[PDB]
Ligand binder design. Structure first.
Ligand SMILES: NS(=O)(=O)c1ccc(CCN(Cc2ccc3ccccc3c2)C(=O)CN(CCC(=O)O)CCc2ccccc2)cc1
Ligand SMILES: [Zn+2]
Length: 257
């Protein structure tokens, strides 16, 4: 099965998922001097006040926090998007060292990690139908750098001990994802894909320019998770990121000058 090792990592994924070599794959390098300011882009609307978190889970390739998406509770609108996108889950990608771990890069710079808030377009009724559409999902991507702690992340960090290995989950109610957002909503946007199998080309990417800072102790807790299930040889869950893919016939748009 697919993963991030030498024999099953991103350079192998195209064999099971040939769209891996497609025309709108993610992530990409964001060349800040070539991205064009688009004054027709609207402010992003992030409406998370009624978010209802449900569970936190180790799925063998990351950890994710899932939300109730059976009603318009936590939604993303505006920016480049048409219509209403409901928050389904968030998860992270991170490195073995602070100089790598993000999926998107900025002028080839890699951050220590990247947060993905995954939303689906309610005009398609369910996420499984949305993944089959070119505008079915919107992922809000936020870079993490190591410095000061992020207080809004600590409740996540403190439960990771309870989901060390693949398959483990725990109750994770009343978590407020607004605590993970930087001050500015300035962003870059481009049409792309899921960055893990099935690599479906269904994502409007919205990548915030401002990173959040997390502490060394917080990221070290990410690096203590395991890719393996309980009972198997321990392989630390680190470097669970796909590298930048060819931009091909796409333009990256900036919301800001
Ligand atoms: N990094 S990212 O770009 O933000 C990024 C963001 C989001 C994803 C989603 C990947 N995904 C779907 C999938 C689809 C096909 C696959 C085929 C082979 C291998 C894996 C696959 C994964 C899942 O996690 C599993 N579904 C969760 C819901 C959903 O589909 O979202 C379960 C489908 C299911 C099954 C039973 C009950 C409920 C739901 C990837 C990358
Ligand atoms: Zn992701």
């Amino acid at each position: 099965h697919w993963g991030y090792g030498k024999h099953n990592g991103p350079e192998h994924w195209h064999k099971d998922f040939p769209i891996a070599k497609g025309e709108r794959q993610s992530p990409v390098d964001i060349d800040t001097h070539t991205a064009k300011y688009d004054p027709s882009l609207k402010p992003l609307s992030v409406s998370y006040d009624q978010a209802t978190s449900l569970r936190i889970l180790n799925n063998g390739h990351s950890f994710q926090v899932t939300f109730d998406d059976s009603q318009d509770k936590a939604v993303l609108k505006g920016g480049p998007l048409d219509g209403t996108y409901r928050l389904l889950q968030f998860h992270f990608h991170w490195g073995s060292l602070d100089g790598q771990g993000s999926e998107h890069t900025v002028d080839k710079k890699k951050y220590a990690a990247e947060l993905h808030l995954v939303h689906w377009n309610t005009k398609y009724g369910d996420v499984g139908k949305a993944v089959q559409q070119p505008d079915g999902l919107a992922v809000l991507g936020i870079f993490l750098k190591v410095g000061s702690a992020k207080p809004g992340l600590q409740k996540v960090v403190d439960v990771l001990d309870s989901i060390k290995t693949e398959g483990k989950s725990a109750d994770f109610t009343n978590f407020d994802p607004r605590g993970l957002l930087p001050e500015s909503l300035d962003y870059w946007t481009y049409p792309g894909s899921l960055t893990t199998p099935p690599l479906a080309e269904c994502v409007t990417w919205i990548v915030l320019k401002e990173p959040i800072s997390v502490s060394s102790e917080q990221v070290l807790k990410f690096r203590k998770l395991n890719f393996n299930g309980e009972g198997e040889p321990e392989e630390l869950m680190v470097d669970n990121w796909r590298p930048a893919q060819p931009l091909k016939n796409r333009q990256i748009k900036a919301s800001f000058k």
